[PDB]
Structures are given as structure tokens and as C-alpha cells.
Amino acid sequence: MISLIAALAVDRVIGMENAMPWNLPADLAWFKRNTLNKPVIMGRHTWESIGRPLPGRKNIILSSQPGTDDRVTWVKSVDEAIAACGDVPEIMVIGGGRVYEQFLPKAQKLYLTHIDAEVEGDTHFPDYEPDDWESVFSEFHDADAQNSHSYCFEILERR
Ligand SMILES: NC(=O)c1ccc[n+]([C@@H]2O[C@H](COP(=O)([O-])OP(=O)(O)OC[C@H]3O[C@@H](n4cnc5c(N)ncnc54)[C@H](OP(=O)(O)O)[C@@H]3O)[C@@H](O)[C@H]2O)c1
Ligand SMILES: Nc1nc(=O)c2nc(CNc3ccc(C(=O)N[C@@H](CCC(=O)O)C(=O)O)cc3)cnc2[nH]1
Ligand SMILES: [Mn+2]
Ligand SMILES: [Mn+2]
Ligand SMILES: [Mn+2]
User: Fold this and answer.
1) What total of structural domains would you count in the chain?
2) How far is the CA of 59 from the centre of ligand 4 (A)?
3) Taking every annotated instance into account, which residue ranges of this chain make up the domain DHFR?
């Protein structure tokens, strides 16, 4: 099973200048809980944005060019990325925009954080078709002293 996990600001913005400009510790904790002990697939730009391997997860990087770091696994196509995960129950695709576009048709589940923040960005999550997806979990949180925007954790499953 392939799942996508992402945090979206207004208008599906996910990034600007290879960074995420907001800071929502509660959402990063949600990301860690939902990805730990699973393989994570990311594009090369997202690997550069994170800047280090994510511990406790098999890190698989898509790039058309040879890898430059043997602490992670490098692959050259979507099918190779999936194969490199082996026989696991759930593969987590962690972006960025180009990678989400390619894996969305293959995904059965979306873990989305909707952040009430207006961000100029240069990268968006794919337009997906709402009729294809059932919301099975949602949890809203107001802003607090640690999280400066309100946010909604949602899990959607392909109908
Ligand atoms: N809010 C969030 O949830 C979230 C999550 C992830 C990322 N982001 C943000 O998203 C932005 C990065 O997204 P992006 O769309 O620019 O880049 P990306 O999807 O992270 O990376 C694209 C790169 O991945 C490689 N790639 C993708 N598909 C491939 C394929 N089928 N075969 C081989 N290589 C492939 C290529 O690398 P080569 O050029 O080396 O061939 C391509 O240039 C950043 O702003 C980051 O902060 C946000
Ligand atoms: N909901 C969501 N939020 C995100 O921030 C997110 N980020 C990415 C890609 N970028 C990043 C950037 C940093 C870390 C990171 O530092 N993660 C630590 C945080 C642990 C914690 O804060 O409790 C990790 O071990 O996962 C992960 C992904 C992909 N999907 C996402 N999905
Ligand atoms: Mn092929
Ligand atoms: Mn197999
Ligand atoms: Mn806000």
C-alpha cells in the first residue's frame, strides 16, 4: 500500500524556495509518528531541503543522477523506488510536488495536514479529485503557544 503524507497551507502551497517557511512542531510530531519504522520515498529537492537522513526509517531518494551519500538509498524510477521498499505493509511518500504528482494515482491513503496560513509558494500539492477520497479521520487544533497557526489532521482513503 502506498500512502502520501503532506502539510498544505492555503491554496495547496507546500513550499517556497526549497523550504517550508512555517514552524508547526505538532505537525512534525504527527509526521514522525506516521512515518517511523516505514520506508520513506522523496525526491532529490526534498532530500536537500531536509538536509540529513530521517532516523528510524529507510530513506529512498529519487534522482536521475548517481547518488552522493551512501547513508540513504538512491533509485532512478518510480518502479525502482517501490521495489527498494521490499515487502512492507505501507510505503510513505513524503514529496515534494513532482514526486507527489507521480505517486498520487498509485496511492490508497492520504495523510494531510491543512494549515490555516497564507503562504507565498512555488510548489503545490497535486489537484486531486475530491470524489475519489473518503475522509476517515479529522482532528482540528487551534493555535497555541507552540503552534502559531490552527491546523487540521486528516486521513483520506481512496473509495
Ligand atoms: N509541505 C510538505 O508537506 C512538503 C513535503 C515535501 C516537500 N515539500 C517542499 O517541496 C519542495 C520540493 O518539491 P519539488 O517538486 O521541487 O521537488 P521534489 O519532488 O522533492 O524533487 C524532484 C526531483 O526528484 C527527482 N525525481 C522525481 N521524480 C523522478 C523520477 N520518476 N525518476 C527520477 N528522478 C525523479 C528529480 O531529481 P534529479 O533532478 O536529480 O533527476 C527531480 O528533480 C520544497 O519546497 C520542499 O520544502 C513540502
Ligand atoms: N504533515 C507533514 N508535515 C511536514 O512537515 C512534512 N514534511 C515533509 C518533508 N520535510 C521534512 C522536514 C523536516 C522533518 C523532520 O525534521 N522530521 C523529524 C521531526 C520529529 C519531531 O519533530 O517530533 C522526524 O524525525 O520525522 C521531516 C520532513 C513531508 N511531509 C510532511 N508532512
Ligand atoms: Mn522503467
Ligand atoms: Mn514483493
Ligand atoms: Mn494563520
Assistant:
1) 1
2) 18
3) 1-158
